[PDB]
Amino acid sequence: AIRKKLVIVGDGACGKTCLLIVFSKDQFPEVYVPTVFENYVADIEVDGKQVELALWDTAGQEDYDRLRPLSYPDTDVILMCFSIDSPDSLENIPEKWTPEVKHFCPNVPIILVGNKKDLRNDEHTRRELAKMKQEPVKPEEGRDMANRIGAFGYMECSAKTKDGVREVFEMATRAALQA
Amino acid sequence: AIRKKLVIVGDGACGKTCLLIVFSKDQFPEVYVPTVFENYVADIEVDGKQVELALWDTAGQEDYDRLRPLSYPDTDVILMCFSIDSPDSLENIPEKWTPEVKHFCPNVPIILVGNKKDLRNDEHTRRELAKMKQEPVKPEEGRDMANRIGAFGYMECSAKTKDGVREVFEMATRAALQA
Amino acid sequence: GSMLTKDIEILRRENEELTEKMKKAEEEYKLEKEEEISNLKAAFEKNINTERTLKTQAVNKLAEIMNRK
Amino acid sequence: GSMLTKDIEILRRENEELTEKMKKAEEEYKLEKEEEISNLKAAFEKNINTERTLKTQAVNKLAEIMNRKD
Ligand SMILES: Nc1nc2c(ncn2[C@@H]2O[C@H](COP(=O)(O)OP(=O)(O)NP(=O)(O)O)[C@@H](O)[C@H]2O)c(=O)[nH]1
Numbered sequence: 001a002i003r004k005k006l007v008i009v010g011d012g013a014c015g016k017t018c019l020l021i022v023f024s025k026d027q028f029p030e031v032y033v034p035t036v037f038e039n040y041v042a043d044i045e046v047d048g049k050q051v052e053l054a055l056w057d058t059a060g061q062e063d064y065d066r067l068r069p070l071s072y073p074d075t076d077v078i079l080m081c082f083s084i085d086s087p088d089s090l091e092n093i094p095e096k097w098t099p100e101v102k103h104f105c106p107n108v109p110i111i112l113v114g115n116k117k118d119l120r121n122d123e124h125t126r127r128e129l130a131k132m133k134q135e136p137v138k139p140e141e142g143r144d145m146a147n148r149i150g151a152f153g154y155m156e157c158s159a160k161t162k163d164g165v166r167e168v169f170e171m172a173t174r175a176a177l178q179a
Numbered sequence: 180a181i182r183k184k185l186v187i188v189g190d191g192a193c194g195k196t197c198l199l200i201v202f203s204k205d206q207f208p209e210v211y212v213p214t215v216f217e218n219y220v221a222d223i224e225v226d227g228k229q230v231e232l233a234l235w236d237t238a239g240q241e242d243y244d245r246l247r248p249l250s251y252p253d254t255d256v257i258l259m260c261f262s263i264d265s266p267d268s269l270e271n272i273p274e275k276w277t278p279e280v281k282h283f284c285p286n287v288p289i290i291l292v293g294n295k296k297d298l299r300n301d302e303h304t305r306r307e308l309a310k311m312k313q314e315p316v317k318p319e320e321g322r323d324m325a326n327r328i329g330a331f332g333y334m335e336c337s338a339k340t341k342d343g344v345r346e347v348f349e350m351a352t353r354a355a356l357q358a
Numbered sequence: 359g360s361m362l363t364k365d366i367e368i369l370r371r372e373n374e375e376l377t378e379k380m381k382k383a384e385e386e387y388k389l390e391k392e393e394e395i396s397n398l399k400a401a402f403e404k405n406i407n408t409e410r411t412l413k414t415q416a417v418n419k420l421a422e423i424m425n426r427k
Numbered sequence: 428g429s430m431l432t433k434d435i436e437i438l439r440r441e442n443e444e445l446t447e448k449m450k451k452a453e454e455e456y457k458l459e460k461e462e463e464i465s466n467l468k469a470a471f472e473k474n475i476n477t478e479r480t481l482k483t484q485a486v487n488k489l490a491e492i493m494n495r496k497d
């Protein structure tokens with residue numbers, strides 16, 4: 001079995017940790033706690049290949065910017081996230097996360113991920129986003145961003161409903177399996 | 180060459196770091212910055228014995244209480260400090276530092292140290308302490324405390340004027356050299 | 359009726375209504391000073407419950423890391 | 428002379444005085460808000476910089492210890 005390293009980044013509170021815990025621990029973290037950095041492991045198979053996926057969680061919090069580069073070395077694939085219920089975290093994709101990742105992980109496959117897909121059609125979310133005259137991110141917007149920053153691919157998911165979770169990691173693994 | 184471990188504790192801002200830097204680096208820290216933890220080394224000779232003194236700096240900040248026990252293992256001598264210009268840091272000797280040290284460093288020689296001796300006769304200090312109806316600590320007070328907590332000895336000093344600095348460490352070393 | 363009698367009555371009423379424009383004036387000035395702080399604090403809290411959380415997490419992680427060093 | 432009378436005059440100064448009492452109750456309630464907020468924001472500012480300083484130091488130490496290019 002092969003070992004591959006996956007690192008996940010993106011705005012704070014956009015769902016990185018819940019996504020990793022659901023996939024590696026089969027559970028959904030109940031309470032929110034800003035991440036410093038943590039490391040998990042998980043098994044997965046794609047195209048008939050056993051791969052041990054090393055999952056590096058990082059801080060989305062600005063205040064922890066200084067620790068992030070400690071996780072980037074020897075990365076095989078990157079999951080760059082934003083929340084579908086936050087257009088702001090989307091704008092931070094090309095404004096912050098992309099430049100940083102391409103500086104620390106040159107030529108490393110980037111999978112653009114849009115978390116909290118289950119909020120896309122949530123009234124409370126639509127109502128609250130309406131106040132700032134915004135609306136949940138549309139799939140087209142995510143795709144454009146993926147192409148714009150030259151990602152390996154785009155994938156939407158919800159750690160809450162589990163929808164898309166699998167696809168996110170099968171795509172990331174394939175990416176980490178290129179050559 | 181005998182290698183001995185010295186650990187220093189006491190209220191925040193009472194002078195621990197300046198005392199260690201003056202003695203090990205021959206200089207006086209300029210600006211004040213709460214210590215997380217740091218480590219220094221210094222050579223000393225007493226009773227005709229060569230000794231490499233390992234100096235473990237610790238946080239006086241309550242908020243860092245969690246890290247202090249990481250420094251206590253295998254300690255040969257402890258410098259428990261308070262500031263001569265702060266009766267409050269003195270009261271914290273039996274109220275906090277003594278119980279903690281005797282729990283983590285059973286039977287380890289304790290040298291009670293009173294820093295900032297140069298402020299004992301400073302008008303601004305006496306003036307200010309007067310507002311809280313207090314006055315700088317008197318030598319009898321520190322000695323009393325030393326006996327009360329069963330210290331190996333009492334020593335006053337000023338990292339500013341260098342007065343007593345040497346005695347503090349010659350006493351601590353002798354203590355770490357008992358048996 | 360005499361005018362004097364009336365002018366007096368009208369004066370005891372204004373001075374009286376004036377006293378009600380004080381007790382219910384102060385009761386007023388209360389929300390002003392009470393609201394402007396009932397949120398000036400709750401605002402300074404959210405801002406500290408944030409920095410305090412980030413402080414604690416970093417500290418605990420440092421402890422975790424050094425206990426492993 | 429004048430047209431002023433005993434009883435009206437007394438209730439008039441009384442209206443006045445009662446009014447002044449209010450002018451003062453205010454100027455005093457102000458300089459009370461001006462200090463309350465002052466000393467409040469004063470502490471609630473040295474209260475945060477305190478936590479912010481401890482946060483930064485711990486963070487930097489975590490980096491220093493973890494970081495290989497240092
Ligand atoms: N509706 C919904 N909420 C989610 C989903 N995933 C996570 N959340 C919620 O979003 C909040 C933050 O999630 P978390 O994964 O901890 O965010 P993070 O990106 O890891 N935060 P940080 O960068 O500070 O470390 C939590 O309250 C969590 O329950 C999801 O798929 N749907």
Ligand SMILES: Nc1nc2c(ncn2[C@@H]2O[C@H](COP(=O)(O)OP(=O)(O)NP(=O)(O)O)[C@@H](O)[C@H]2O)c(=O)[nH]1
Pocket residue numbers: 189190191192193194195196197198208209210211212213214215237238239240294295296297298336337338339340
């Ligand atoms: N007058 C005088 N000031 C001193 C002396 N030693 C230290 N100080 C001052 O006291 C302040 C705190 O000193 P420092 O050694 O950093 O204190 P600490 O006990 O190590 N602090 P912490 O527990 O937070 O780590 C500094 O501003 C420093 O200049 C001294 O001998 N005399």
Ligand SMILES: [Mg+2]
Pocket residue numbers: 016017018033034035057058
């Ligand atoms: Mg997280």
Ligand SMILES: [Mg+2]
Pocket residue numbers: 195196197212213214
């Ligand atoms: Mg210090």
